[PDB]
């Protein structure tokens, strides 16, 4: 074990004593109890490096740095020359992790973790098992110490069999210490795992900085700019996943959605492994956006420039200008990781880096020596499937009716989709090995199926934290993907024609595209790397792990009465195309797309405690409609519902006048109110109208013809009259008390009339009982 393998673990286990201390195993502080917990573990796995990590557990309740001549006594009694270290080479890393814990942020035992969105509410202690019941921030309850004891016992069970490297201590602690409170104080929204992650990250950066205890004891490391915030944005994601003609099926779309995340993880892992950093040096990687806390040498900037030029050149050669990566770094100081002097130095440094990132994303593909040059080549033709759109005759017709020539990327991608149900993961190897399905900017990937054993020193394992049947040579890298999709009679991915046949009503395909609202302002308010890590990981766990729970039918105890077009089945007709970061894009049968929108919204309202909201566009298309129009409709609809109130759904494209008073969208507290109002009066369950409207089912069609008069002019008053002229002719006197009399309450404050809003409740019933 070298100094970095020691330091990245010592930054990872420096606060391991806090789950032991609140579980009652020894006495003292959280420092001596953690080292006493560790000191029997070195006699368990045989490796005497756990006894060395007890020294990194031996920091806090300080004044031991006045006892430093006794600290060399406690170091020499363990003989650190048994692994190729000296005394000062351990003592320097000890002071590095001490300094790094002060760079993670600026009582009663059983105090829980407070949620990062609404700081009042709190979680019970749970486990990151996405096939279980998942946490929602509830009222402030004392965490029972026996659950901490069970956590400590399961940690003893899962720390012996785990290897003593960072790649196994990261997901083992992430499975248990995610929702545990780091510091038991009010308003502490900082996870224990994220504090450990940022501590190990800043510790490994300061170790690779060159700062020793001569620099730490002086307090100079906070002022010397010894860090690097490296952010990277994937610009052009929407023009990469979705610019797909009608020949592209749902398998190929989901394959491109996996492929984009594979390219992103390849760049992140290359920056990790070419700097010397573990997976703890990534604050977040989600939605094509990633942030890395790294060291600051004159040569690390050169390594990053080599990586940036390499990845940008591979993207420009492969996918011409439809997927750009902006990788910009800002040299920050240790002073810029906290709240000093009242101002938010971390948010100001992140805003400076984001301004540099926007300057970069303007100058898109700024480093290509022959970008703007003439003399283009010969014999070029675009494939119909991709819009990769500049190969030569290299493109090869296969995996379909073999008369349409097809790019090799989408040759590999339908093959990826054919393994996509049975896929267990990928393996990041070199680009010229056996079984290499897709490439990357640096590395090819081997699809780890249900029986194989690939190795490329890194294994990207999907949606789990237990490595299991993968060898002890490679770096186990987990990654999360919202994966849910309706299997066909075979087991493979259903297409659009396979999905929209299960539409309770008209044969139309439902497409949903969302966003979390005002989230960029939400991450200019967290003033620590710990707070940013927790506030990004808890957000990303919703749109990558919780979605498969809400689609499968869980979380019913808080979702409740959404608009229910039908019974929510066992296996829905719902296929998640791309959910990650903040947004989520889900296609399927429209009768379940509709219910999924309100289920996602109300579970997310529960999940953030109401301090955040999500916008959702919806769309219904023919099953033969091209996917690029199917995304350019819902992107415009999400932008229109984004502009006109920022927290609103776009249920169905309605006609409106042009005065700026009629908004196309719907507040959720408006639409769920309306579906609680007008739907159970006129609509029964499961595709059949109400017994009063039975055999008079052309009545609701006449209301849209009435409403068109209000659409053509708002000032006239014919609509509320002809509504009663319709409803009197059929005896239904009571089904629309709002539509018959013009309400002065809306014309007081210049709000639209109550017949404007009801048609979005009408048409979704009218699509439900159409034949």
């Amino acid at each position: 074990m070298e100094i970095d393998e020691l330091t990245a673990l010592g930054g990872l286990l420096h606060d391991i004593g806090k789950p032991v201390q609140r579980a009652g195993l020894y006495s003292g502080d959280h420092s001596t109890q953690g080292a006493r917990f560790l000191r029997d573990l070195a006699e368990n796995t045989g490796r005497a490096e756990y006894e060395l990590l007890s020294l990194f557990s031996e920091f806090h309740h300080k004044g031991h740095m006045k006892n430093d001549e006794l600290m060399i006594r406690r170091i020499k009694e363990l003989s650190p020359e048994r692994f190729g270290l000296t005394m000062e080479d351990v003592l320097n890393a000890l002071w590095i992790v001490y300094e790094a814990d002060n760079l993670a942020s600026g009582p009663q035992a059983s105090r829980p973790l407070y949620s990062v969105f609404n700081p009042g509410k709190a979680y019970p202690w749970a486990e990151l098992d996405f096939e279980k019941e998942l946490p929602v921030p509830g009222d402030v309850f004392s965490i029972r110490s026996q659950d901490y004891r069970e956590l400590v016992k399961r940690l003893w069970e899962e720390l012996s069999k785990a290897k003593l490297r960072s790649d196994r201590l990261l997901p083992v602690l992430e499975k248990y210490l995610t929702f545990v409170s780091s510091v038991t104080s009010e308003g502490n929204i900082i996870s224990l795992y994220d504090h450990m992650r940022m501590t190990s990250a800043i510790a490994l950066a300061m170790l690779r900085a060159g700062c020793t205890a001569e620099d730490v004891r002086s307090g100079r490391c906070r002022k010397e700019k010894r860090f690097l915030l490296i952010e990277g944005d994937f610009s052009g994601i929407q023009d990469f996943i979705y610019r797909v003609s009608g020949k592209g099926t749902l398998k190929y779309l989901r394959a491109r959605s996996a492929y984009l995340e594979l390219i992103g993880w390849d760049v992140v892992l290359e920056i990790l492994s070419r700097l010397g950093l573990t997976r703890a040096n990534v604050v977040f990687n989600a939605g094509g956006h990633f942030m890395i806390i790294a060291q600051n040498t004159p040569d690390a900037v050169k390594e990053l420039e080599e990586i940036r030029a390499k990845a940008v050149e591979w993207l420009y050669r492969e996918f011409e200008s439809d997927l750009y990566l902006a990788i910009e770094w800002e040299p920050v100081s240790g002073r810029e990781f906290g709240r000093e002097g009242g101002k938010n130095l971390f948010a100001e440094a992140r805003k400076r880096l984001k301004h540099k990132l926007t300057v970069r994303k303007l100058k898109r593909f700024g480093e290509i020596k022959g970008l703007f040059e003439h003399g283009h080549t010969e014999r070029l033709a675009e494939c119909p499937v991709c819009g990769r759109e500049l190969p030569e005759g290299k493109l090869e017709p296969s995996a379909s009716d073999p008369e349409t020539k097809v790019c090799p990327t989408c040759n590999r991608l339908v093959s990826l989709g054919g393994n996509l149900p049975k896929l267990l993961g990928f393996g990041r190897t070199a680009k010229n090995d056996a079984g290499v399905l897709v490439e990357g900017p640096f590395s090819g990937f081997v699809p780890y199926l249900q029986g194989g054993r690939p190795v490329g020193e890194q294994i990207l394992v999907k949606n789990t934290l237990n490595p299991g049947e993968i060898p002890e040579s490679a770096q186990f890298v987990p990654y999360f993907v919202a994966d849910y999709f309706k299997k066909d009679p075979k087991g493979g991915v259903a297409t659009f024609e396979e999905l929209s046949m299960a539409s309770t009503g008209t044969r139309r395909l439902g497409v949903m595209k969302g966003d979390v609202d005002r989230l960029g302002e939400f991450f200019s308010s967290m003033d620590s790397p710990s707070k940013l890590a927790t506030a990004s990981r808890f957000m990303d766990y919703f749109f990558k792990g919780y979605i498969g729970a809400i689609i499968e039918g869980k979380f019913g105890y808080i979702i409740g009465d959404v608009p229910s077009l039908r019974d929510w089945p066992e296996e829905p007709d719902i296929v998640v195309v791309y959910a990650g970061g903040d947004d989520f894009f889900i296609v399927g049968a429209w009768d379940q797309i509709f219910e999924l929108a309100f289920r996602v919204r109300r579970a997310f309202n529960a999940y953030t405690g109401g301090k955040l909201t999500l916008s959702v566009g919806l769309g219904y298309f023919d099953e033969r409609t091209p996917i690029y129009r199917m995304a350019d409709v819902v992107s415009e609809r999400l932008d229109t519902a984004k502009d006109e109130g920022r927290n609103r759904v776009f249920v169905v494209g309605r006609s409106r006048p042009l005065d700026g008073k009629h908004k196309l969208s719907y507040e959720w507290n408006h639409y769920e109110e309306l579906w609680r109002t007008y739907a159970p009066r006129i609509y029964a369950g499961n595709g059949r109208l109400k017994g009063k409207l039975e055999s008079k089912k052309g009545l609701l069609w006449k209301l849209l013809e009435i409403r068109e008069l209000y659409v053509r002019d708002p000032n006239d008053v014919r609509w509320a009259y002809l509504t009663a002229y319709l409803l009197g002719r059929h005896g239904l006197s009571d089904l629309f008390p709002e539509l018959v009399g013009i309400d002065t309450k809306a014309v007081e404050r210049k709000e639209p009339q109550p017949v404007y809003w009801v048609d979005g409740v009408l048409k979704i019933v009218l699509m439900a009982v159409r034949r």
């Binding site: 301004h355 926007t358 300057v359 303007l362 100058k363 898109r364 040059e373 070029l380 932008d639 502009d643």
Partner: protein, 277 residues
């Protein structure tokens, strides 16, 4: 700069907004139709070599929309300090939906002043599900082929910064030549004025093929069959970015036909003072 404008009153749908180079293709076929075979753009080489076309938006009334001075995207937060501390999200209206602006919000959308976005955009990018028919029997075949669709009083325009002799000799006869249905076209000339400050670095107003000089620019990729054989991709700067380190990016000769097609991309300036970069 007193550059004149040409307002094209439509009578119905267009296929697309003509992208500032497809007009110079269409001008080429127009002067290929009239004036014989050698008064075509070979003869108009040195005449567009000092005068530019540089298309832009519809108007929706008479408010001649103009795309974006793209040099407000870096320091947008340096512009909008006068607003309250909920100004972020208006920046997202002026970054993500930043498409087209009024002239009064364009003489001060550059020059570092707090512009305001418009919303009366004359777009109906509709999804017209056209033809399904066999000469004898049924045909199912819903092939979409969507098009653009306008407002009641709107219409495209574009600009002309050149001598009016060259305008009335080639382009102004051609702009009434242009008038399947989507070629609906009525031409009405005009003049226009833009305040346009000092010319260190400023907007191109066209689609642009630059001479290797990148400053803060959306990239584009423009195909085009152009009499049969498919033209290459020909990477372009989009509508309205800032390359003013002495531009003059020449038109590019192509291959495939008897006489060469050569693609536009040469730009004309404006006035911007950009913050930094």
């Amino acid at each position: 700069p007193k550059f004149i404008a040409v307002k094209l009153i439509p009578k119905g749908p267009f296929r697309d907004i003509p992208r500032a180079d497809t007009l110079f293709g269409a001008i080429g076929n127009a002067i290929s139709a009239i004036h014989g075979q050698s008064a075509v753009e070979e003869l108009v080489d040195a005449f567009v070599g000092g005068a530019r076309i540089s298309s832009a938006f519809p108007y929706s009334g008479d408010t001649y929309y103009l795309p974006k001075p793209l040099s407000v995207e870096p320091a947008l937060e340096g512009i909008l300090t006068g607003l309250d501390e909920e100004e972020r999200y208006t920046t997202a209206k002026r970054l993500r939906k930043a498409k087209y602006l009024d002239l009064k919000n364009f003489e001060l959308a550059l020059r570092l002043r707090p512009f305001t976005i418009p919303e009366e955009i004359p777009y109906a990018r509709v999804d017209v599900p056209r033809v399904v028919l066999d000469r004898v029997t049924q045909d199912s075949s819903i092939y979409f082929w969507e098009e653009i669709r306008f407002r009641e009083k709107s219409g495209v325009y574009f600009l002309y910064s050149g001598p009016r002799e060259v305008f009335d000799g080639y382009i102004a006869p051609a702009m009434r030549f242009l008038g399947w249905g989507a070629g609906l076209f009525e031409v009405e000339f005009h003049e226009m004025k833009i305040d346009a400050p000092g010319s260190e670095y400023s907007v191109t107003l066209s689609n642009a093929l630059p001479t290797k000089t990148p400053v803060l620019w959306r990239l584009l990729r423009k195909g085009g069959w152009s009499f049969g054989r498919r033209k290459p991709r020909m990477t372009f700067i989009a509508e309205g970015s800032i390359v003013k380190n002495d531009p003059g990016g020449m038109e590019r000769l192509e291959l495939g036909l008897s006489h060469e097609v050569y693609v536009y991309g040469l730009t004309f300036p404006l006035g911007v003072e950009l913050p930094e970069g």
